[PDB]
Protein backbone atom coordinates (compact mmCIF):
# COMPACT_ATOMS: atom_id res chain seq x y z
CA UNK A 1 0.00 0.00 0.00
CA UNK A 2 2.01 3.07 -1.21
CA UNK A 3 1.63 6.15 0.72
CA UNK A 4 -1.19 7.98 0.92
CA UNK A 5 -1.52 12.14 0.20
CA UNK A 6 -3.96 13.98 2.23
CA UNK A 7 -3.88 17.67 2.47
CA UNK A 8 -4.46 19.38 6.05
CA UNK A 9 -7.96 21.43 6.30
CA UNK A 10 -10.22 19.58 3.87
CA UNK A 11 -13.83 19.73 3.38
CA UNK A 12 -14.85 16.75 3.03
CA UNK A 13 -17.82 15.44 3.51
CA UNK A 14 -16.17 13.75 6.70
CA UNK A 15 -15.95 10.67 7.12
CA UNK A 16 -14.17 10.84 4.02
CA UNK A 17 -13.24 7.35 1.74
CA UNK A 18 -9.36 7.33 0.85
CA UNK A 19 -8.26 3.74 -0.73
CA UNK A 20 -10.23 0.68 -0.71
CA UNK A 21 -8.54 -2.50 0.95
CA UNK A 22 -8.18 -5.63 -1.30
CA UNK A 23 -12.67 -11.60 4.58
CA UNK A 24 -13.54 -8.97 7.08
CA UNK A 25 -11.89 -5.60 7.54
CA UNK A 26 -9.49 -3.75 10.32
CA UNK A 27 -7.94 -0.76 10.95
CA UNK A 28 -4.60 -0.34 13.89
CA UNK A 29 -2.15 1.62 15.26
CA UNK A 30 -1.44 5.54 16.35
CA UNK A 31 -4.29 7.65 14.69
CA UNK A 32 -7.35 4.61 14.57
CA UNK A 33 -7.29 2.37 17.86
CA UNK A 34 -4.30 4.30 19.59
CA UNK A 35 -4.58 8.27 20.46
CA UNK A 36 -5.44 9.70 18.60
CA UNK A 37 -8.20 7.61 18.81
CA UNK A 38 -10.47 7.09 15.92
CA UNK A 39 -9.02 9.89 13.50
CA UNK A 40 -8.82 7.07 10.76
CA UNK A 41 -11.56 4.04 10.20
CA UNK A 42 -12.28 1.28 8.05
CA UNK A 43 -15.67 -0.01 6.72
CA UNK A 44 -15.79 -3.63 8.06
CA UNK A 45 -17.14 -5.43 5.11
CA UNK A 46 -16.49 -2.97 1.94
CA UNK A 47 -12.93 -2.26 3.47
CA UNK A 48 -12.91 1.22 2.50
CA UNK A 49 -10.62 2.94 4.86
CA UNK A 50 -11.90 6.35 5.77
CA UNK A 51 -10.59 9.80 7.75
CA UNK A 52 -12.84 11.07 9.92
CA UNK A 53 -12.24 15.03 10.66
CA UNK A 54 -9.99 17.22 8.89
CA UNK A 55 -6.21 16.87 9.70
CA UNK A 56 -3.42 19.63 11.19
CA UNK A 57 -0.38 19.16 9.54
CA UNK A 58 1.13 21.03 12.65
CA UNK A 59 -0.59 18.54 14.20
CA UNK A 60 0.78 16.13 12.93
CA UNK A 61 2.36 15.50 9.57
CA UNK A 62 2.62 11.84 9.05
CA UNK A 63 0.37 8.52 10.54
CA UNK A 64 1.99 4.55 10.24
CA UNK A 65 -1.10 2.68 10.56
CA UNK A 66 -1.28 -1.39 9.80
CA UNK A 67 -4.61 -3.21 8.06
CA UNK A 68 -5.60 -6.96 8.92
CA UNK A 69 -0.24 -10.34 5.99
CA UNK A 70 -0.18 -7.43 7.89
CA UNK A 71 -0.24 -4.80 5.55
CA UNK A 72 1.34 -1.31 6.05
CA UNK A 73 -0.29 1.99 5.98
CA UNK A 74 1.81 5.07 5.67
CA UNK A 75 -0.44 8.56 5.76
CA UNK A 76 1.10 11.70 4.93
CA UNK A 77 -0.40 14.83 5.67
CA UNK A 78 0.30 17.37 2.61
CA UNK A 79 0.40 21.48 3.48
CA UNK A 80 -1.67 24.52 3.16
CA UNK A 81 -0.51 27.83 3.53
CA UNK A 82 -2.32 28.65 6.95
CA UNK A 83 0.22 30.70 8.56
CA UNK A 84 1.28 34.00 8.20
CA UNK A 85 4.95 35.04 8.27
CA UNK A 86 6.20 37.13 11.56
CA UNK A 87 9.69 39.11 11.70
CA UNK A 88 10.94 37.51 15.06
CA UNK A 89 11.56 41.42 16.32
CA UNK A 90 9.33 44.83 15.49
CA UNK A 91 12.66 46.49 15.37
CA UNK A 92 16.41 44.92 14.23
CA UNK A 93 19.15 47.23 14.58
CA UNK A 94 22.80 47.28 12.88
CA UNK A 95 25.61 48.85 12.30
CA UNK A 96 29.02 49.72 10.01
CA UNK A 97 31.70 51.92 9.78
CA UNK A 98 31.12 54.61 7.14
CA UNK A 99 34.20 53.10 5.01
CA UNK A 100 32.96 50.11 4.16
CA UNK A 101 32.88 49.43 0.59
CA UNK A 102 29.80 48.08 -1.30
CA UNK A 103 28.59 44.26 -0.54
CA UNK A 104 29.52 44.87 3.17
CA UNK A 105 26.98 42.27 5.32
CA UNK A 106 24.94 44.81 7.96
CA UNK A 107 22.48 42.78 9.78
CA UNK A 108 20.10 39.70 9.00
CA UNK A 109 16.56 39.81 9.84
CA UNK A 110 14.86 36.95 10.51
CA UNK A 111 10.72 36.08 9.73
CA UNK A 112 9.03 33.03 11.57
CA UNK A 113 6.42 31.11 9.05
CA UNK A 114 5.00 27.79 10.62
CA UNK A 115 4.19 26.04 7.33
CA UNK A 116 6.53 23.44 5.59
CA UNK A 117 9.60 25.22 4.05
CA UNK A 118 10.53 21.88 2.78
CA UNK A 119 8.26 20.40 0.03
CA UNK A 120 6.61 23.51 -0.39
CA UNK A 121 6.78 27.39 -0.52
CA UNK A 122 4.27 28.01 2.40
CA UNK A 123 7.37 28.30 4.63
CA UNK A 124 9.27 30.27 2.55
CA UNK A 125 9.39 33.17 3.25
CA UNK A 126 11.15 36.24 0.53
CA UNK A 127 12.62 39.61 2.23
CA UNK A 128 12.18 42.55 0.30
CA UNK A 129 13.38 46.19 1.53
CA UNK A 130 9.64 48.50 1.21
CA UNK A 131 11.36 51.70 1.88
CA UNK A 132 14.58 53.55 3.06
CA UNK A 133 14.52 56.77 4.71
CA UNK A 134 16.78 59.54 4.68
CA UNK A 135 17.25 59.13 0.83
CA UNK A 136 20.45 60.64 1.19
CA UNK A 137 22.94 60.79 -0.55
CA UNK A 138 20.30 58.62 -2.23
CA UNK A 139 17.77 56.19 -2.17
CA UNK A 140 17.93 52.19 -2.21
CA UNK A 141 21.09 52.38 -0.56
CA UNK A 142 20.53 48.97 0.64
CA UNK A 143 19.29 45.43 -0.60
CA UNK A 144 18.57 42.32 1.42
CA UNK A 145 18.87 38.67 0.52
CA UNK A 146 16.06 37.07 -0.87
CA UNK A 147 15.91 33.75 1.85
CA UNK A 148 18.98 34.66 4.04
CA UNK A 149 17.50 38.07 4.99
CA UNK A 150 21.17 39.87 5.24
CA UNK A 151 20.95 43.24 4.45
CA UNK A 152 23.89 44.54 2.55
CA UNK A 153 24.89 48.31 1.98
CA UNK A 154 25.84 49.09 -1.93
CA UNK A 155 26.20 52.50 -2.09
CA UNK A 156 29.44 54.91 -1.45
CA UNK A 157 28.64 58.13 0.42
CA UNK A 158 27.95 57.04 3.65
CA UNK A 159 28.99 60.11 5.83
CA UNK A 160 27.96 59.80 9.30
CA UNK A 161 28.20 63.66 9.60
CA UNK A 162 25.62 63.89 7.06
CA UNK A 163 23.67 60.67 8.03
CA UNK A 164 24.00 58.66 10.71
CA UNK A 165 21.30 56.70 10.56
CA UNK A 166 19.08 54.85 8.22
CA UNK A 167 16.00 53.51 9.31
CA UNK A 168 14.57 50.70 6.57
CA UNK A 169 11.23 49.48 6.14
CA UNK A 170 11.24 45.99 5.49
CA UNK A 171 9.35 43.12 4.48
CA UNK A 172 8.80 39.41 4.48
CA UNK A 173 6.66 37.26 1.84
CA UNK A 174 6.15 33.35 2.44
CA UNK A 175 4.94 31.69 -0.68
CA UNK A 176 8.42 32.46 -1.73
CA UNK A 177 7.26 36.07 -2.53
CA UNK A 178 3.52 35.09 -3.92
CA UNK A 179 1.55 34.93 -0.86
CA UNK A 180 1.24 36.97 2.49
CA UNK A 181 3.89 39.80 3.62
CA UNK A 182 4.70 41.14 7.09
CA UNK A 183 6.82 44.45 7.76
CA UNK A 184 9.42 44.98 10.23
CA UNK A 185 12.11 47.92 10.52
CA UNK A 186 15.64 48.12 10.60
CA UNK A 187 17.84 50.65 11.79
CA UNK A 188 21.21 50.99 10.20
CA UNK A 189 23.81 52.88 11.93
CA UNK A 190 26.90 54.58 10.98
CA UNK A 191 29.26 54.17 13.16
CA UNK A 192 31.60 57.16 14.35
CA UNK B 1 -4.16 4.00 -6.52
CA UNK B 2 -4.37 7.77 -7.52
CA UNK B 3 -1.59 9.57 -6.86
CA UNK B 4 -2.45 12.94 -4.92
CA UNK B 5 0.65 15.66 -6.38
CA UNK B 6 0.25 19.39 -4.54
CA UNK B 7 0.94 21.78 -7.24
CA UNK B 8 3.78 24.17 -6.78
CA UNK B 9 6.45 21.59 -5.07
CA UNK B 10 9.99 22.73 -4.11
CA UNK B 11 11.67 18.85 -4.97
CA UNK B 12 14.13 19.07 -6.21
CA UNK B 13 13.10 17.49 -9.68
CA UNK B 14 13.10 15.00 -10.68
CA UNK B 15 11.18 13.83 -7.98
CA UNK B 16 9.94 10.31 -7.26
CA UNK B 17 5.99 9.27 -7.22
CA UNK B 18 5.58 5.62 -7.39
CA UNK B 19 7.26 2.59 -7.93
CA UNK B 20 5.37 0.60 -10.28
CA UNK B 21 6.09 -3.70 -10.31
CA UNK B 22 4.71 -5.74 -12.54
CA UNK B 23 2.97 -9.18 -11.83
CA UNK B 24 6.31 -11.55 -13.57
CA UNK B 25 8.53 -11.18 -10.19
CA UNK B 26 11.59 -13.94 -10.30
CA UNK B 27 10.70 -14.93 -13.95
CA UNK B 28 12.67 -12.20 -15.80
CA UNK B 29 14.09 -8.59 -16.58
CA UNK B 30 11.28 -5.75 -16.98
CA UNK B 31 11.21 -2.28 -18.69
CA UNK B 32 8.55 0.09 -17.89
CA UNK B 33 7.36 2.61 -19.79
CA UNK B 34 4.60 5.45 -19.31
CA UNK B 35 2.34 7.51 -21.83
CA UNK B 36 -0.76 9.51 -21.93
CA UNK B 37 -0.86 13.66 -21.65
CA UNK B 38 1.88 14.51 -19.44
CA UNK B 39 4.31 11.90 -20.52
CA UNK B 40 4.22 11.22 -24.50
CA UNK B 41 1.92 13.65 -25.83
CA UNK B 42 0.96 17.16 -24.94
CA UNK B 43 2.26 18.53 -22.13
CA UNK B 44 5.05 16.25 -22.81
CA UNK B 45 7.69 15.50 -20.51
CA UNK B 46 6.15 16.37 -17.04
CA UNK B 47 6.22 13.27 -16.12
CA UNK B 48 8.98 10.29 -16.97
CA UNK B 49 9.45 6.40 -15.47
CA UNK B 50 12.70 4.74 -14.64
CA UNK B 51 13.33 2.11 -17.08
CA UNK B 52 14.44 -0.59 -15.00
CA UNK B 53 13.47 0.73 -11.18
CA UNK B 54 10.14 1.10 -12.21
CA UNK B 55 10.11 4.54 -10.63
CA UNK B 56 7.37 7.13 -11.27
CA UNK B 57 9.02 10.58 -11.29
CA UNK B 58 7.64 14.40 -12.16
CA UNK B 59 10.10 15.98 -13.56
CA UNK B 60 8.41 20.06 -12.93
CA UNK B 61 6.20 21.87 -10.54
CA UNK B 62 2.85 20.95 -11.50
CA UNK B 63 -0.08 24.13 -11.54
CA UNK B 64 -3.82 22.48 -10.71
CA UNK B 65 -5.47 25.42 -12.74
CA UNK B 66 -3.20 24.68 -15.35
CA UNK B 67 -3.91 20.93 -15.21
CA UNK B 68 -6.25 19.59 -12.25
CA UNK B 69 -5.34 15.92 -13.30
CA UNK B 70 -3.57 12.88 -15.65
CA UNK B 71 -4.40 9.93 -16.85
CA UNK B 72 -1.38 8.02 -17.57
CA UNK B 73 -0.91 4.37 -18.41
CA UNK B 74 2.04 2.19 -17.65
CA UNK B 75 3.61 -0.28 -19.21
CA UNK B 76 5.19 -3.82 -18.36
CA UNK B 77 7.36 -5.12 -21.72
CA UNK B 78 9.94 -7.89 -21.18
CA UNK B 79 13.47 -7.35 -22.92
CA UNK B 80 11.83 -9.71 -25.46
CA UNK B 81 9.16 -6.67 -26.11
CA UNK B 82 6.94 -9.13 -24.66
CA UNK B 83 3.75 -7.84 -22.74
CA UNK B 84 1.93 -10.01 -19.64
CA UNK B 85 -0.93 -7.35 -18.35
CA UNK B 86 -2.91 -4.91 -19.32
CA UNK B 87 -1.43 -1.08 -19.40
CA UNK B 88 -1.89 0.40 -15.66
CA UNK B 89 -4.03 3.26 -15.06
CA UNK B 90 -1.88 6.08 -13.17
CA UNK B 91 -4.30 8.77 -11.91
CA UNK B 92 -2.00 11.85 -10.81
CA UNK B 93 -4.24 13.76 -9.27
CA UNK B 94 -3.36 17.59 -8.27
CA UNK B 95 -4.59 19.30 -5.15
CA UNK B 96 -4.77 22.42 -5.07
CA UNK B 97 -2.54 25.19 -3.40
CA UNK B 98 -3.51 28.35 -2.02
CA UNK B 99 -2.01 30.47 -5.23
CA UNK B 100 -4.57 33.10 -5.95
CA UNK B 101 -5.83 36.12 -3.49
CA UNK B 102 -9.63 36.44 -3.70
CA UNK B 103 -10.49 39.32 -5.75
CA UNK B 104 -13.47 41.89 -5.92
CA UNK B 105 -15.94 42.07 -8.97
CA UNK B 106 -16.05 45.90 -8.23
CA UNK B 107 -14.11 48.18 -6.22
CA UNK B 108 -16.81 49.92 -5.49
CA UNK B 109 -20.51 48.47 -5.03
CA UNK B 110 -23.83 50.39 -4.60
CA UNK B 111 -27.38 49.32 -3.34
CA UNK B 112 -29.97 50.75 -1.74
CA UNK B 113 -32.83 50.09 0.14
CA UNK B 114 -36.37 51.71 1.66
CA UNK B 115 -35.87 53.86 4.53
CA UNK B 116 -38.79 52.04 6.52
CA UNK B 117 -37.97 48.37 6.23
CA UNK B 118 -37.86 45.23 8.56
CA UNK B 119 -34.41 44.77 10.05
CA UNK B 120 -32.66 41.69 8.32
CA UNK B 121 -34.25 42.80 4.71
CA UNK B 122 -31.37 42.35 2.13
CA UNK B 123 -29.91 45.40 0.78
CA UNK B 124 -27.75 44.48 -2.12
CA UNK B 125 -24.58 41.59 -2.72
CA UNK B 126 -21.23 41.54 -3.30
CA UNK B 127 -19.16 39.28 -4.83
CA UNK B 128 -14.91 38.51 -4.94
CA UNK B 129 -13.83 35.75 -6.79
CA UNK B 130 -10.79 33.36 -6.37
CA UNK B 131 -9.58 31.01 -8.79
CA UNK B 132 -8.21 27.92 -6.46
CA UNK B 133 -10.69 24.92 -5.17
CA UNK B 134 -13.43 25.50 -3.40
CA UNK B 135 -14.89 21.50 -3.62
CA UNK B 136 -11.94 20.21 -1.73
CA UNK B 137 -9.95 22.99 -0.11
CA UNK B 138 -11.20 26.20 1.62
CA UNK B 139 -8.72 27.87 -0.86
CA UNK B 140 -10.90 28.88 -2.99
CA UNK B 141 -13.62 29.67 -0.55
CA UNK B 142 -14.37 33.19 0.38
CA UNK B 143 -15.50 35.01 3.69
CA UNK B 144 -16.92 38.42 3.92
CA UNK B 145 -17.00 40.76 6.31
CA UNK B 146 -17.37 44.61 7.56
CA UNK B 147 -14.27 46.67 8.87
CA UNK B 148 -16.09 49.41 9.01
CA UNK B 149 -19.15 52.08 9.17
CA UNK B 150 -19.78 55.74 8.05
CA UNK B 151 -21.28 57.56 9.21
CA UNK B 152 -22.34 56.63 12.80
CA UNK B 153 -25.73 57.92 12.51
CA UNK B 154 -28.04 56.71 14.34
CA UNK B 155 -25.28 54.77 15.71
CA UNK B 156 -22.51 52.33 14.81
CA UNK B 157 -23.07 48.71 13.26
CA UNK B 158 -26.41 48.83 11.62
CA UNK B 159 -25.53 46.68 8.43
CA UNK B 160 -24.00 42.98 8.45
CA UNK B 161 -23.01 40.90 5.68
CA UNK B 162 -23.24 37.10 5.37
CA UNK B 163 -19.84 35.45 5.47
CA UNK B 164 -20.81 33.28 2.34
CA UNK B 165 -23.22 35.20 -0.02
CA UNK B 166 -22.10 38.64 0.46
CA UNK B 167 -25.72 39.62 0.47
CA UNK B 168 -25.35 42.63 3.20
CA UNK B 169 -28.27 43.82 5.17
CA UNK B 170 -30.20 46.27 7.36
CA UNK B 171 -29.93 45.18 11.38
CA UNK B 172 -31.73 48.18 12.71
CA UNK B 173 -34.63 50.05 12.58
CA UNK B 174 -34.49 54.26 12.28
CA UNK B 175 -32.98 54.60 8.66
CA UNK B 176 -33.91 58.53 7.41
CA UNK B 177 -32.53 60.22 4.84
CA UNK B 178 -33.67 63.17 6.02
CA UNK B 179 -31.00 62.33 8.94
CA UNK B 180 -28.56 60.39 6.44
CA UNK B 181 -29.06 59.88 3.29
CA UNK B 182 -26.31 57.88 2.48
CA UNK B 183 -23.76 54.92 3.86
CA UNK B 184 -20.44 54.07 2.79
CA UNK B 185 -19.09 50.07 4.08
CA UNK B 186 -15.52 49.33 3.78
CA UNK B 187 -15.98 45.66 3.21
CA UNK B 188 -13.19 42.68 3.31
CA UNK B 189 -13.32 39.14 1.37
CA UNK B 190 -10.32 36.77 3.13
CA UNK B 191 -9.96 33.09 1.35
CA UNK B 192 -9.69 30.20 2.89
CA UNK B 193 -12.83 30.64 4.72
CA UNK B 194 -11.08 33.76 7.11
CA UNK B 195 -7.83 32.26 7.07
CA UNK B 196 -6.07 33.11 4.29
CA UNK B 197 -5.14 36.52 2.18
CA UNK B 198 -7.57 39.63 2.57
CA UNK B 199 -8.75 42.33 0.09
CA UNK B 200 -10.64 45.13 0.45
CA UNK B 201 -13.50 47.09 -1.59
CA UNK B 202 -16.63 49.30 -1.00
CA UNK B 203 -20.01 49.12 -0.04
CA UNK B 204 -22.12 52.15 -1.04
CA UNK B 205 -25.53 52.14 0.22
CA UNK B 206 -28.71 54.53 -0.51
CA UNK B 207 -31.78 55.51 1.71
CA UNK B 208 -35.08 55.49 -0.28
CA UNK B 209 -38.32 57.62 0.05
CA1 LIG C 1 -2.65 23.54 10.00
CA1 LIG D 1 2.86 30.47 5.43
CA1 LIG E 1 0.25 24.52 7.06
CA1 LIG F 1 -1.35 27.39 -9.79
CA1 LIG G 1 -7.16 31.66 -2.74
CA1 LIG H 1 -4.34 26.96 -6.60
Same mark, same amino acid.
Given at each position: ????????? +?????????????????????????????????????????????????????????????????????????????? $?????? +????????????????????????? !?? !?????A !???????????????? $??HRST??????????????????????? /??????? +????? /?? /???????
Open positions: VAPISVPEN +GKGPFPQRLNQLKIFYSITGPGADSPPEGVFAVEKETGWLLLNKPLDREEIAKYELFGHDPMNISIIVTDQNDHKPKF $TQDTFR +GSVLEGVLPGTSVMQVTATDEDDAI !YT !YNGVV !YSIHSQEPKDPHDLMF $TIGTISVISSGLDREKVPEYTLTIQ /ATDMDGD +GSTTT /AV /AVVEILD
